[PDB]
Amino acid sequence: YSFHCEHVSSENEDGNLLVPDTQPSLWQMTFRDFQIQAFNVTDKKFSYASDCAGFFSPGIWMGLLTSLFMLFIFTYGLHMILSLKTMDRFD
Amino acid sequence: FPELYFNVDNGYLEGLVRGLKAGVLSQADYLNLVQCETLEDLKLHLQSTDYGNFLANVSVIDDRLKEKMVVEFRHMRNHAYEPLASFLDFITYSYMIDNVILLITGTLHQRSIAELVPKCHPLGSFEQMEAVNIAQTPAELYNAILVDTPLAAFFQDCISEQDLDEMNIEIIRNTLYKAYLESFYKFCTLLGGTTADAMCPILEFEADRRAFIITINSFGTELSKEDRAKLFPHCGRLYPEGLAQLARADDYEQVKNVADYYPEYKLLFEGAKTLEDRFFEHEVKLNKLAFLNQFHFGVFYAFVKLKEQECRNIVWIAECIAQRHRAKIDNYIPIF
Amino acid sequence: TGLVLLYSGVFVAFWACLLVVGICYTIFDLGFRFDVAWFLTETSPFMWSNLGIGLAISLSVVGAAWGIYITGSSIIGGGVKAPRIKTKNLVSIIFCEAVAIYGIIMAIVISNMAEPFSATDPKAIGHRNYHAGYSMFGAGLTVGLSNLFCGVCVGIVGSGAALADAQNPSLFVKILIVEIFGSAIGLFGVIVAILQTSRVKMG
Amino acid sequence: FEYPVVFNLVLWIMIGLALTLIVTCYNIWNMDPG
Amino acid sequence: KNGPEYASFFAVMGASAAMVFSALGAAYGTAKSGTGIAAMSVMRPEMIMKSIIPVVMAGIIAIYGLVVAVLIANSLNDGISLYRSFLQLGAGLSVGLSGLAAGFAIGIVGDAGVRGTAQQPRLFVGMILILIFAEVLGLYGLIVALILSTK
Amino acid sequence: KNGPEYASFFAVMGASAAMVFSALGAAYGTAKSGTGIAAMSVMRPEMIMKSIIPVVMAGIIAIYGLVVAVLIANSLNDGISLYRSFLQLGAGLSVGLSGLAAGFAIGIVGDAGVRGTAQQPRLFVGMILILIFAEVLGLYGLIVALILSTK
Amino acid sequence: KNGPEYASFFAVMGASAAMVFSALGAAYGTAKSGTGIAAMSVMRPEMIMKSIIPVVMAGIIAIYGLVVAVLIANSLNDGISLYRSFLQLGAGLSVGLSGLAAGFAIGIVGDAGVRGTAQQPRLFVGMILILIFAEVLGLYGLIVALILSTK
Amino acid sequence: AAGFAIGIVGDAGVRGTAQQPRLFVGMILILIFAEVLGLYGLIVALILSTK
Amino acid sequence: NGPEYASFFAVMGASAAMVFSALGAAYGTAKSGTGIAAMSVMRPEMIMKSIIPVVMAGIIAIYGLVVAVLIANSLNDGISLYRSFLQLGAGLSVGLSGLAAGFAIGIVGDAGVRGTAQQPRLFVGMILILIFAEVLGLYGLIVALILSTK
Amino acid sequence: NGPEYASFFAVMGASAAMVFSALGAAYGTAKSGTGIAAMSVMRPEMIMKSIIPVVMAGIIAIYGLVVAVLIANSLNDGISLYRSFLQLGAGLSVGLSGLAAGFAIGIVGDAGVRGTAQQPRLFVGMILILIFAEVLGLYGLIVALILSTK
Amino acid sequence: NGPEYASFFAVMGASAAMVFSALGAAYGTAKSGTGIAAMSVMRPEMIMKSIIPVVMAGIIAIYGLVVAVLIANSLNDGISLYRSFLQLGAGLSVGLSGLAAGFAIGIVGDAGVRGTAQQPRLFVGMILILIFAEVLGLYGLIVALILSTK
Amino acid sequence: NGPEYASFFAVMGASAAMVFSALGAAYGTAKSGTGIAAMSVMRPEMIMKSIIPVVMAGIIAIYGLVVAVLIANSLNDGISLYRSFLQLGAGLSVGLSGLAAGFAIGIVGDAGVRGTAQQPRLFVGMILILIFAEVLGLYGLIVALILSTK
């Protein structure tokens, strides 16, 4: 397949793809669109795309798994507080 | 799985009714009361047990014993939250049914509500729902008042115009008890687990006593075979087949051979102790077996049916003593 | 059941999505998009490590507090008629409280071996470091959840022993051996937990 | 480029909101007029 | 030295879970036992001040989660590393689920205790000893979270 | 220095969850104790102004959540950081869900207390003390939200 | 300057949730209290115009969700920024689901409050005091929805 | 939500109307409040569709 | 050697051998030991004899213990991926069957002792069924050792 | 050879062969063993004759063990993907049908021993329906063997 | 040739033809097997007459076994994707309709056997409803074959 | 031709038409078969007369049969994606509507034969209701036939 991304910029901020070796680098660049293919080009046209986008990125895929972890702790705690009836008569 | 809960709500009350089980008079406790000779000596040995100092202030032994098991039962109902408070309400319906038939009789014969307080069982009582206290109307404008009482859903087989002397006084108790036993079985089937195998064997035999004792007294009576068919509770082991052959019985041996299909109910027909003294010892054999299982609601209903055996046995000891006929004094039920 | 329909209405639904999401990744070509390698590597070795220290003590004491209230209702329940149970049967509280000790002994041990680093690349974060991450999660899981199960174990037997001692005084010293085998599982939890963290070192 | 961020805020929000419809619609469907 | 921008989510979530899960348990100890005070006081009204002992022991569970939530919130900082932030999330679950647990233990025992203390006063020293063993489980939530947050 | 386009979502959700979850606790404290006033009124109607102490202290849980809601909304700007917006999210959850728990505890003891107060008025000096212990649980969620959102 | 294409979904979803969740609160407030009016009118048919104060205070909760819906829908345009669009989503949940709480609490104390009024008419001056603290929860959720949407 | 409120109070309302007809003037008055919730549904839908 | 994430499945196999066997030993002792205190009140003679279902359920706990010792010592930093998948199924095979043996023990261990309080002729048959419940715990062990040692 | 994660399916085929057959043999032991104690109190003669369903639950346990040790002998590093799916379908089919045979034994095995205390005529008819509840587990075995040889 | 994952679906067709048919065969035997006990306590003569519901649930098992050996013998390394998806729908058709047919047998089996206990005239009518209940399993089989031919 | 994955939706049209239609026809047989055995104790005359809902529910099974073979005969290797979606939409339209008609036949087939024993004038009206409860599946045919042919 062929890769395709949307931001392949430099200037590492959170998760941009390009990183220089030395941190205060003199060179920077940006590709506001991108599609590149090697080793299987046919008929002078790209194949199916392999996007960089993803339903999940590794920031949202730890934060979900901890939020979904302590939602479950809450719904055990909330289940018990939602289940203490009082008595009807007093003597 | 339904046992690591149930101590959230019913932890304390379970250990309470187990503690009240130890107050039941044992076999050695029964032997010393046979050796008594007067009611004053009967008062002395009962002060050694848990009952003590209850006669500080022979038919007074009937009332002062059974008033103790009412306040012990009322104290348990004051602390059960919601999984059990309806269950203890089901035990009171057997006493509310015997109360309400006592009430429609004086209603039919214009005997007012002044006789209600001293002549009814305090377990199933009417000290709330004050509409029933005012009603003197002859059994037709009182049924509209009767439905403001938890016996309303059992009156769905009781037509209001059928109440006015077309049905006998005794017949309406059994078809109300028929409606009572189907609901309490289905309520104990909705609850599952340990309270569904320790309680429903008790309700099967209780429905089968109402299979046998009905047809054995329905011989000389002028109630037909279709009447005793619908007075059988459709609940126990005898449901698809044994209820059919009991309708065509007409004879004492013809109810025996239909009990010979079950090895539990035969060897109980060898009373030939009478039959009801043999049905009672099997009943307290089942209520004692309910005390084995721990995390279940059947320990309360097994306590009440044994506590009524305690008030039954002491009076039978007292009646053989006061009338001085203690050659049949050993014919009690030694439950523990 | 009303509230059970919520969990059994979500667990069937979430599995039904993950079933049909499962036969639509293979059926096109998109199994390369799944990447359980990218899930275990790119996240962190600290999310597993720091959760395991938390689950070590918290899931032990949620069995220890579970073990207390099951038999604590049965102490005071039988204690109304038989008040002598309050001195003898407190060891049933201790065995469902010593399970919490097995967590806090373990939770200090697992936190003693966690150490930071500077790498941010899963090739720079070596297999000496990722294996240190999951092992704190696994050892924290098996000292937490096994102590939960042995916590409810000695509590349920402790509630039965509080009722049996109310009827007969001589019985309680005979039923106490059952609570030893229940509390032995808490001992079986910590031996696994130190062994899974024996050869482990972060850095 | 903000595809996870869309699946952040569209999927779990629509299901959050889907529930609080259904658990509420359940609670009014069988009430107790008695 | 600088970490990711989403790194401070976990230590904040550890600070909230130290106060959410502690308050859920401490509300159970005040409700389940506070219901038992009402059923007790009708028959035996003398031991009403004597029976706020399980209620005040559930109150220590609430400040058990409060102190650690202060120590995490004082340790928050822009650009904390992933090692530093996750140490407080594991600190939060250690104190939160323990306080949610021991909140239940004081609740059921304190409910059954004051119902039984009213019918037998000898059980009071026995009831208060079980509540010691229940409330000390919340103290085990501290000295692992206090070690984790200091580390 | 400038934040991303989506970073303002959590501090928006922090101001939302601080008001939603605290109101659901303040609703239950009114609702569950409001049926307790109704069964009490038919027997002892002298304690009506005395019995509205649970329903006012349930309303404090809402104004606990209200003052942190506007305090988060005052700090909202376009282009805030993730660290600044997560700080208001955890501030919102620690006051709403803890207020939800404290709203649960007042509603139960409010129901059980005022029904026993009709049968015995000696309970009223003890019932009001358990509600304070239930209310201060809401106050514990306040001082963690203020120490989170302001910094 | 301008926002992305998916931005206006959240502001629209805040407009619907402000109207839906307030109406489900206005449903339960009207429905649960409405049966108590029918239960009262068999025995005491006099308090039938005085007793519709729960079903009119439940009506205010619908108007609480109404005005913020018009507040949100009048600020809508293409290219609305994501900071502006999330504010409307944070508005609509904070008025709807909080109004759902005030909708739930009004119908509960409205139903039980008119049951005891048939047996005690002195409760009617006290029942409206309970309904104020039930209805003021929608008022708190309203003013936070306005302070989130005015920005 | 509107039909949920009309369904409940329309159920219990016509039960008490047969038992006492004084409820009938009051039953409609609650039913109007149950119905205008849907009328607030219009003026959010109509104000959104014309944009 | 193997990849960096490879040790994860070996760790999860090491824990799952212990926790699921601990769950079986939990219900095997709690559900049955409820019946032991139940039996002791009406017949206090078989109290020291009928603690055999709570000690057979203890062998379920040491079944998951040994395979946890076998696996966690065979761990190393960066093992091969083929060796770690075997240790994952080694934990599940002894764990869930040890979980299954606990539900087998606690039901028939509670049912047997109630009949023992009513008729002690059951006691020769009751212990025979507990052997058939114990091979369920035993069968999980021999599949775990033949899988982890490859 | 094949992919690295290919052996994961054949490991799960080994585990699901055992833990589902053990879960089937447990319920057939538990539900029938509860019926043994209820029968033995009234009719203590047929107590070693009534343990025909509990050993017939035990044969479901060895049915999984045949397939489980067969797969663990065939496991090897770098097995192809087509070989590993065949062992997954082998362990699934002998497992879940053994779970079905374990469920089918326990219901009628309990119902048979509740009736044979009441009538000795059912004891020949009880063993008929238990055989039809046992051949379901046998049908899972013969398709597990034909799926693991290829 | 076909892809590597294509053989997984055909193996899933072999197992789902078995375990779904086994679940219907287990439920039909168990639900109707309980009614044999309640019938026998009054009418023990119709014991051998009442085996006809549980053997017609046994037809559902061998209906799954017939398809399972057909899918397993057509399996080969590198089958096409059109070949494998035919076998997956072949396994679901005989299994799930067999799961339905096994459900319908056990309900009328429990009702009919209790019904023919009170009156033996139902025996010519009970077997008529069971035929229509059985043939639903045959309708799954005949479409399982013609999908597996291509 | 089309893509390689296209056959899976046309298979799911062939299988779900045979599962869901037989799932409804099983419930219509089982719920009404209970009603046959309930009235046979009192009223044994209407047994041949009362099996009308069972043979009306049997048409629902052959409703799914005719659309299954019509779809399976149209199955070729690599059919177009537009053609395969037409067969999935046809198979869902006949199976789930047949599942609806299986529900409606089962309820009134149960309740109606309870009433025809106590009053035989219902027998004209009870089958008259069932025509409306049967043609719902017949509307499922003429949408499934028009969709699979395109």
Residue numbers in the entry:
A (entry chain s): 365 to 455
B (entry chain d): 4 to 60, 67 to 281, 288 to 351
C (entry chain b): 2 to 204
D (entry chain r): 302 to 335
E (entry chain q), F (entry chain p), G (entry chain o): 5 to 155
H (entry chain n): 105 to 155
I (entry chain c), J (entry chain g), K (entry chain k), L (entry chain l): 6 to 155
Quoted from the paper:
V-ATPases localize to the plasma membrane, endosomes, and membrane vesicles and play an important role in proton homeostasis. Mammalian V-ATPase is a rotary machine made up of two domains: the ATP-hydrolytic V1 domain and the proton-translocation Vo domain. The V1 domain consists of three catalytic AB heterodimers that form a heterohexamer with threefold rotational pseudosymmetry, three peripheral stalks each consisting of the subunits EG, one central rotor including subunits D and F, and the regulatory subunits C and H; the proton-translocation domain Vo consists of the proton transport subunit a, a ring of proteolipid subunits c9c”, rotary subunit d, and subunits e and Ac45. The structures show two unique mammalian V-ATPase components, Ac45 and (pro)renin receptor (PRR) in the Vo domain.
The 3D classification enabled us to distinguish two different states. The 3D refinement of individual classes yielded a resolution of 3.4 Å (state 1) and 3.8 Å (state 2). In both states of our study, subunit H is well determined in the cryo-EM map. Structural comparison did not reveal notable conformational changes in subunit H with a root-mean-square deviation (RMSD) of 0.656 Å for 365 Cα atoms. The structural analysis shows that the ABsemi, ABclosed, and ABopen heterodimers share similar conformations in states 1 and 2. The structures of the A3B3 hexamer in the two states showed that ATP hydrolysis triggers a conformational change in the subunit DF, which further induces a shift of subunit d. The c-ring is subsequently rotated and results in a continuous proton translocation across the membrane. The structural analysis shows that the TM1 of subunit c”, Ac45, and PRR do not change their relative positions in these two states. However, they have rotated ~120o with the c-ring, suggesting that the entire c-ring including subunits c, c”, Ac45, and PRR function as a rigid domain in proton translocation. We found that the switch of AB heterodimers provides the energy necessary to trigger a rotation of subunits DF resulting in the spinning of subunit d coupled with the entire c-ring region, and each state will rotate ~120°.
